[PDB]
């Protein structure tokens, strides 16, 4: 249905709100994504070593989650500014998943990160059904090239 | 001169060529970048520990260097394609700093690797006038947040 400009307009769109940056409004926008994070998925703590009991207060008065709030919020912003050349997309998940190889994630996590972030996203504000639909639709084609890449690269896959 | 769409247009379709990928050709693609590196600039080796003596054939032969021949290939679609996105660029530019912090590079590098790059597109074709100047644009405005970025970070810089 969607074009993947339409895809990647909607997605980048959908992230005005939480743009990445060096003020105390920027790194609100990716240490939140861990106080959401851990507040509702706290059975994921587990793969981040020394916080796994944290709370969201642990993870707001943390520097470690104020410096990975950036990193992530900066991912799903290239995924979305990138979305529409589909073989630098490609090369970007690859090069995630190869980074995230030593924490030996369950692969069915690599689509749940997707329900993960647009319920963020509705933690903070509108997230309409055209946005909602966007990134579920990049979410898909990151599980794809994720589970391809993984069976090519003989780990663990779904 | 030129606003910030030409000049990612221009950097995007200079890469064209240079695609990122797992077949031969693109594993050849990021390979062949270290290659003219280490030819031209062996003063460069230093920072890659262990193949501080390799030559372009050792490259060539080298399993390290097709996989970083990727990341930086990769890297280098990326800047190209979220320039005109200017906070999520200058996001990516700090966060390529973060991650050579423990090279300890001589800060006046991040401007000069603007020219080995465009330097390695004169390394397989046509470079246009507006494509090189497209390249010089964007390493200026990279050099410009690495260094402020730097200053910010109690570290080295120019
Ligand atoms: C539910 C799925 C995921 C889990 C459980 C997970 C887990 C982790 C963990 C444990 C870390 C290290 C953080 C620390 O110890 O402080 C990390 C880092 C990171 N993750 Fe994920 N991750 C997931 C999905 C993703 C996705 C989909 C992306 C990209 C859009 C991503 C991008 C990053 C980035 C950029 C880093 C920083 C280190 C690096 O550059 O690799 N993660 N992740
Ligand atoms: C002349 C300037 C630069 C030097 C000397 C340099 C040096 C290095 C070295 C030594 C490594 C580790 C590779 C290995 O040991 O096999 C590395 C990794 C890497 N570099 Fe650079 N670098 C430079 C500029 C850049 C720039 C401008 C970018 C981005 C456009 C970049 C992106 C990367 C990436 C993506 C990696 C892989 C590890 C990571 O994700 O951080 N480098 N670099």
Same mark, same amino acid.
């Given at each position: 249905?969607?074009?993947?400009?339409?895809?990647?307009?909607?997605?980048?769109?959908?992230?005005?709100?939480?743009?990445?940056?060096?003020?105390?409004?920027?790194?609100?926008?990716?240490?939140?994504? #861990?106080?959401?994070?851990? *507040?509702?998925?706290?059975?994921?703590? %587990?793969?981040?070593?020394?916080?796994?009991?944290?709370?969201?207060?642990?993870?707001?008065?943390?520097?470690?989650?104020?410096?990975?709030?950036?990193?992530?919020?900066?991912?799903?912003?290239?995924?979305?500014?990138?979305?529409?050349?589909?073989? %630098?997309?490609?090369? #970007?998940?690859?090069? *995630?998943?190869?980074?995230?190889?030593? #924490?030996?994630?369950?692969?069915?996590?690599?689509?749940?990160?997707? *329900?993960?972030?647009?319920? #963020?996203?509705?933690? %903070?504000?509108?997230?309409?059904?055209?946005?909602?639909?966007?990134?579920?639709?990049?979410?898909?084609?990151?599980?794809?090239?994720?589970?391809?890449?993984?069976?090519?690269?003989?780990?663990?896959? %779904?």
């Amino acid at each position: 249905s969607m074009n993947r400009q339409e895809i990647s307009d909607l997605c980048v769109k959908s992230l005005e709100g939480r743009m990445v940056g060096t003020e105390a409004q920027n790194i609100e926008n990716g240490n939140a994504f #861990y106080r959401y994070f851990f *507040t509702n998925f706290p059975d994921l703590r %587990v793969y981040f070593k020394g916080a796994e009991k944290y709370t969201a207060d642990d993870v707001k008065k943390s520097e470690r989650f104020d410096k990975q709030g950036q990193r992530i919020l900066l991912a799903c912003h290239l995924l979305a500014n990138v979305y529409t050349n589909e073989e %630098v997309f490609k090369g #970007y998940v690859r090069e *995630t998943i190869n980074r995230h190889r030593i #924490y030996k994630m369950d692969p069915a996590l690599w689509m749940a990160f997707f *329900t993960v972030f647009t319920g #963020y996203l509705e933690s %903070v504000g509108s997230l309409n059904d055209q946005q909602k639909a966007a990134w579920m639709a990049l979410g898909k084609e990151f599980n794809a090239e994720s589970q391809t890449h993984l069976k090519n690269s003989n780990l663990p896959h %779904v």
